[PDB]
Design a protein around this ligand. Structure first.
Ligand SMILES: Cc1cn([C@H]2C[C@H](O)[C@@H](COP(=O)(O)OP(=O)(O)O)O2)c(=O)[nH]c1=O
Ligand SMILES: Cc1cn([C@H]2C[C@H](O)[C@@H](COP(=O)(O)OP(=O)(O)O)O2)c(=O)[nH]c1=O
Ligand SMILES: Cc1ncc(COP(=O)(O)O)c(CN)c1O
Ligand SMILES: Cc1ncc(COP(=O)(O)O)c(CN)c1O
Ligand SMILES: [Cl-]
Lengths: 350, 348
């Protein structure tokens, strides 16, 4: 267990990366949507099973995926949209165009508490599918349909979990994924928006300051936009990593979830998850039955997410009870069983 | 035939040797082993002063936004900046989405007359395409009125003012390493900033999360993901190692030809430097408004005013011609351009 790493060891396939970036070299186009962007967006669409009704839009990072998604929709609708995010999530959904988002608690199933938005003025909600686990997506889709609200899934850590027969990224108006090095599908930095086609053109123009190349000299910036595009260099490293490893990651991460599911240590439960098939997790998240401190676990382990608003009791209860265990393609079954042994010993003494 | 930028190709051997450091530790972002190498290269090669931090970011826009976000976090409020209309949209986006837009004066920078009766914390002055404003008039004004001063040097990485890189003036400046810039490769940015703000700006590239506080780290709503990936750092560092000297020298030599052979009724963009600027494009001003589609070679007008009601900014936009300036251009091509522009002056 001294050998545990958070992330599998990742190295460029240099001959493959050079083959991809040769198309940049040929045209001197390495950004502003060069020849690699379409290849990675196509690879994501076909490999992650994104539906035809959705755009696949790569961005510089998972954060810029969320911010470009919101910026683009704000520009299309002509106002700064007010979003609610859950406290039990990463800071990205209270930053950029979401810097004044309303923060509310989660319910005990891991997602934003729809009861907390009863008396609030807002335009949409952002629901986080934690570390590859999914919430009961239909209850958010129905709520947002009934109340004419936009629905975004923060799928930063959740690229290939299936809910009722399709990739969870295909639900709500939009979802985002992260290709940050720390993520299963990540290499360096990167993000992706999966979004209803109605907003696709404004979101793409929104990566380029709001400047529509189709208008030529008549293009006009939007104060809702920024520089949010993915560089073709980064697209090549991410595409090469996925071409060489995507299949092994989806299979092994499912195999790793399978061992914990069938061999749960005493007084630990799996994090709430609504997928029939095993999720593809960024870490294996267990909930101990009472608060505990990370320093009592003698192997590499973390707590996510530190609540954005400390006045959210369910979020804090989860933070206090969660254990996030490394989940990557370098982990051995021997290590998984030894981890389950250590948590059984921890359970005995606490 | 003309191109906006020079053909740029990775030195694969050198890029691989740099990224070998990432491969040995599996660290390719969150400040891997290349970031300090690029920031040191910039410090030494661009002649940044010891009183300044060099902070690499994902792009020139994120350099500006991370600079503002970091200072907002340190001062505990959302700072109100004024920017000039004759600039790129970055200074009216992100934390600057509600910046105040005023006109330029005829020397190419923010008109200090326009801010007399306005409430604001700071100004952003754009040094256009490698040309510099009268930097000390801004430095003195901001000292007298206790205002923050930022130079948008996105296109102005190596223009000197009173003996030192123009990036060393104001509280801070930013540079772009966008592929379209002389020093660029792919995407990238850099903040040059007073050390007082260095720590909060570096933490603000990481959502405001200070890895020094361990589990006590607390995010800022003024921050984001603004860091430069080590992969990009390697491609930018390799390109600068192999080319920065050739670029500075050839861009100066290109400017020399235009300065000494100005086409009729064209003037050099206002430049307060006593040395030739290192330009992202050669910016000429015609004596009257004209349409780009009358120029029969690759050319642009930067910048379309952010506020089209700023009359000097709109006049500059209507009269400007931005001509390619890169190390692939031959002297023969430059004299051909000046020939076509003499013909344009005759016909217009
Ligand atoms: C982004 C990029 C642009 N260019 C060229 C294309 C154009 O002639 C010129 C300007 O590109 P452009 O995309 O117009 O930049 P902007 O919209 O900010 O003006 O640079 C390249 O050669 N390579 C690249 O990677
Ligand atoms: C950024 C990065 C992190 N890591 C490892 C270091 C840590 O053990 C783990 C998490 O990184 P960390 O920097 O803590 O990210 P976060 O703030 O999202 O938790 O990933 C890599 O192995 N490679 C990388 O390029
Ligand atoms: C839930 C969530 N949302 C957004 C992000 C931001 O992704 P990136 O790090 O690629 O900006 C993260 C990554 N920490 C995340 O975990
Ligand atoms: C003056 C100015 N400011 C900021 C930027 C933004 O830099 P980047 O394209 O690297 O985001 C640019 C790029 N055109 C610029 O010209
Ligand atoms: Cl000078």
């Amino acid at each position: 267990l001294e050998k545990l790493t958070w992330v599998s060891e990742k190295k460029p396939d240099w001959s493959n990366v050079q083959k991809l970036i040769a198309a940049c070299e040929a045209t001197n186009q390495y950004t502003n949507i060069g020849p690699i962007i379409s290849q990675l967006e196509s690879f994501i669409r076909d490999s992650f099973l994104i539906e035809e009704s959705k755009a696949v839009i790569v961005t510089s990072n998972g954060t810029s995926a969320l911010h470009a998604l919101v910026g683009g929709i704000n520009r299309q609708l002509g106002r700064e949209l007010k979003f609610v995010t859950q406290s039990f999530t990463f800071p990205s959904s209270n930053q950029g165009p979401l810097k004044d988002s309303i923060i509310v608690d989660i319910d005990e199933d891991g997602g934003l508490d729809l009861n907390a938005v009863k008396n609030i003025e807002y335009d949409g909600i952002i629901v986080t599918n934690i570390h590859g686990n999914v919430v009961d997506i239909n209850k958010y889709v129905d709520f947002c349909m009934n109340h004419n609200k936009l629905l975004i899934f923060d799928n930063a850590a959740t690229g290939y979990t299936f809910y009722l027969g399709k990739n969870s990224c295909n639900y709500g108006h939009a979802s985002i994924i992260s290709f940050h090095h720390t993520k299963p599908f990540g290499f360096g930095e990167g993000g992706c928006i999966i979004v209803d086609r109605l907003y696709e053109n404004n979101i793409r123009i929104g990566l380029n300051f709001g400047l529509d190349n189709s208008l030529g000299e008549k293009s006009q910036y939007s104060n809702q936009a920024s520089n949010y595009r993915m560089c073709d260099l980064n697209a090549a490293f991410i595409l090469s990593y996925l071409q060489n490893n995507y299949k092994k990651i989806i299979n092994r991460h499912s195999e790793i979830y399978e061992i914990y599911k069938n061999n749960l240590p005493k007084r630990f439960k799996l994090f709430p998850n609504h997928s029939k098939k095993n999720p593809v997790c960024s870490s294996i998240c267990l909930l101990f039955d009472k608060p505990f401190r990370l320093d009592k676990i003698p192997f590499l382990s973390r707590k996510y997410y530190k609540p954005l608003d400390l006045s959210s009791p369910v979020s804090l209860d989860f933070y206090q009870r969660i254990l996030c265990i490394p989940c990557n393609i370098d982990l051995t079954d021997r290590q998984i069983y030894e981890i389950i042994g250590v948590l059984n010993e921890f359970a005995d003494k606490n």
